[PDB]
Amino acid sequence: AMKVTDVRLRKIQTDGRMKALVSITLDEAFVIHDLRVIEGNSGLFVAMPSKRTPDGEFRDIAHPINSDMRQEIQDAVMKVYDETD
Amino acid sequence: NAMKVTDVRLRKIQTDGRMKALVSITLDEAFVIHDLRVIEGNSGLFVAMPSKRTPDGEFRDIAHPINSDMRQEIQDAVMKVYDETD
């Protein structure tokens, strides 16, 4: 199964919602940039890079098909976020 | 070595301009990347990566292959479909 093989992030100091900008590498072969760690009072999460669509709303530019893989990415990213000064 | 492009969704665009198609790909039946673009370059058609405009007029490429096998697989899988498309 596909693995997150690298996580690179830069923490941001603010009281805004966006806490870090993140790049992940999948199977040592493909890099996705502009993920973010977001903090709200409902908890921490990792968002995919996204765009405003011809609406209206924002949609992920790149994303897992299966929600289990979304959690996998989040766990891998948050692991590194916690390790980061 | 590379993951496989297991699905390609492609829409041709008709124009004199250099963007000839908008493309979404799926890797190993598990991960989707949208807004790849088939581009007419000086030396022929190629596949460019999702590129997000910044609020200051520049662009950021959101996803790229980081090895040769992965790079060639994207170009090959997408252009294969482009060339099958009327």
UniProtKB/Swiss-Prot annotation, chain A:
The keyword Cell cycle applies. GO terms for biological process: division septum assembly; sporulation resulting in formation of a cellular spore. Keywords: Cell cycle, Cell division, Septation. Could be involved in septation. Belongs to the SpoVG family. This is Putative septation protein SpoVG. The lineage of its organism: Bacteria, Bacillati, Bacillota, Bacilli, Bacillales. The gene is spoVG. The chain holds residues 1 to 84 of 102 of the full protein.
